[PDB]
Amino acid sequence: ENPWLWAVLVLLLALSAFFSASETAITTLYPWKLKELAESKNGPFRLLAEDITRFLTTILVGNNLVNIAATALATELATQAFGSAGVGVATGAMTFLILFFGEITPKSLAVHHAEAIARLAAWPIYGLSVLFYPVGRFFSLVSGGLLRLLGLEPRL
């Protein structure tokens, strides 16, 4: 239980709140209010409006990554402290923290501050998208390919 480790886990939960708040802010502005902000300038809203799929894909990848990285770190601490019971301890604690602070609280906050959050989140998420969006798109393309191979989606 190094002090840095607790600060990394706090950092990861803050990133999870950042991603879930951004998702809600973006989608609640879309499409009509995002376009109006986009035709005025500047500048994140035109970026957001023109490629909302890049942003929501990046958030999906990013939100899962930080939630999984925080759970893994928390499980390392709990099982070193408690042994095999630490898996249940970390599951209970992290489900509360991720649900409360990484999901419910930031989404609730975002509906009331959607414009400010989208404005501030757009460029950091655009930067992450240079890696995350190709990754998510690869996954989705391969997944659809697999579903069609198996006959579970219409052939093409």
75 lies in the binding site for its own copies (CB under 8 A):
yes
To its own copies, the closest distance from the beta carbon of 46 in angstroms equals 28
**Phi, psi angle pair for 104, to nearest 5°:** -70, -50
Angle at which helices 52-82 and 3-29 cross, to 10°: 150
| Interface pattern 91-110 for Mg ion (x via CB under 5 A) | -----------xx-------
Tell me the C-alpha distance between 30 and 44, whole Å. Answer: 14
Task: Give me the residue label for tokens 């301890």.
Answer: 89
To Mg ion, the closest distance from the beta carbon of 127 in angstroms equals 18
Residues with Cβ within 8 Å of 115's Cβ and at least 6 positions away in sequence, in order, are 25, 29, 33, 37
Q: According to CB under 8 A, which one of 108, 123, 124, 130 is a site residue for its own copies?
A: 108
| Interface pattern 84-123 for Zn ion (x via CB under 5 A) | ----------------------------------------
DSSP state, residue 43: S
The answer to whether the CB of 93 falls within 8 A of the CB of 17 is no
104 lies in the binding site for ligand OLC (CB under 6 A):
no
Binding residues for ligand OLC (CB under 6 A): 1, 6, 9-10, 13-14, 17-18, 21, 74, 77-78, 81, 89-90, 93, 97, 101, 106, 117
